Design a protein around this ligand. Structure first.
Ligand SMILES: [Ca+2]
Ligand SMILES: [Ca+2]
Length: 321
């Protein structure tokens, strides 16, 4: 159904490992120092001290590939600057067709387990099947890189590992563009919008894009490297990729106001201005709209008015199907 990346056939390798009663060891990505990195995640980096590569079966008694669906809450960034990738994975979960292309069925830690997992990505104008063993970087029994809000869920950790494999190391994923990951999941071309010169119908473009299941992301541009990952006063993170997850209207002070929802791939650190989780604006909207849209939780997800969105964020990335 897809091209076998590096000649590695999932079905055949899984069958050979299951029948012989052995766990898969990926010869294309060894569980070593080079696979972590060379500088930021190099052997001399403090972030790598004490890292041990362990399979999820060694971490807890009941490891699961997917728990309560493969959703955006399953994407919580670790000790790596791969927000671009993670923002893309979070956006990917909002479209069932794209999610089920990238993450194949029948993968688990119970029946059919052989220490091997696979994902499908778009590479060189075609879908490719990438395999990985389940040895993941851990420190004191906890995942160092991406993890789920659900402690025993490992799909997102394994997808990020597949990306690290394709790119050579986990560090090769530090610093990038959301656009590339969007393209790796759809085979489309991402369009950039300058929010300082935003077209008059941008909200309508966003609404139609989200309804079709397109992948959307946003960020605040930086001029220098020292202001990278810097926090704004209203708690937004600069030079950091966010996933745009919804766009809905609410009745506020007798008028229908345009709102937009985004998610920080850290799974925490949210906007604290108007329309934020604990903001007073929600008290003035009717009970139903309040209960359907607002979720008071430190989950990385929040709402902003479209007026504030275009004043704060500087770039919007939309990848259509
Ligand atoms: Ca989940
Ligand atoms: Ca929230």
């Amino acid at each position: 159904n897809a091209i076998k990346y590096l000649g590695q056939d999932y079905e055949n390798l899984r069958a050979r490992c299951l029948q012989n009663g052995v766990l898969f060891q990926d010869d294309a990505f060894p569980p070593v120092s080079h696979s972590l990195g060379f500088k930021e995640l190099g052997p001399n980096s403090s972030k790598t001290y004490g890292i041990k590569w362990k399979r999820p079966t060694e971490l807890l008694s009941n490891p699961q590939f997917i728990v309560d669906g493969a959703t955006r809450t399953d994407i919580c960034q670790g000790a790596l600057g791969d927000c671009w990738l993670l923002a893309a994975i979070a956006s990917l979960t909002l479209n069932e067709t794209i999610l089920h292309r990238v993450v194949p069925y029948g993968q688990s830690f119970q029946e059919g387990y052989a220490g091997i997992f696979h994902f499908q990505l778009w590479q060189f104008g075609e879908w490719v099947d990438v395999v990985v063993d389940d040895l993941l970087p851990t420190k004191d029994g906890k995942l160092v890189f991406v993890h789920s809000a659900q402690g025993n869920e490992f799909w997102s950790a394994l997808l990020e590992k597949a990306y690290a494999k394709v790119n050579g190391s986990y560090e090769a994923l530090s610093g990038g563009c959301t656009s590339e990951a969007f393209e790796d999941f759809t085979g489309g071309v991402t369009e950039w919008y300058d929010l300082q010169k935003a077209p008059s119908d941008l909200y309508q473009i966003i609404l139609k894009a989200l309804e079709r299941g397109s992948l959307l992301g946003c960020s605040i541009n930086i001029s220098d490297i020292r202001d990278l990952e810097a926090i704004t006063f209203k708690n937004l993170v600069r030079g950091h990729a966010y996933s745009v997850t919804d766009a809905k209207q609410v009745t506020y002070q007798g008028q229908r106001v345009n709102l937009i929802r985004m998610r920080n791939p850290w799974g925490e650190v949210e906007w604290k201005g108007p329309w934020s989780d604990n903001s007073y604006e929600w008290n003035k909207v009717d009970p139903y709209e309040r209960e359907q849209l607002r979720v008071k939780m430190e989950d990385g997800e929040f709402w902003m008015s479209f007026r504030d969105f275009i004043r704060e964020f500087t770039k919007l990335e939309i990848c259509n199907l």
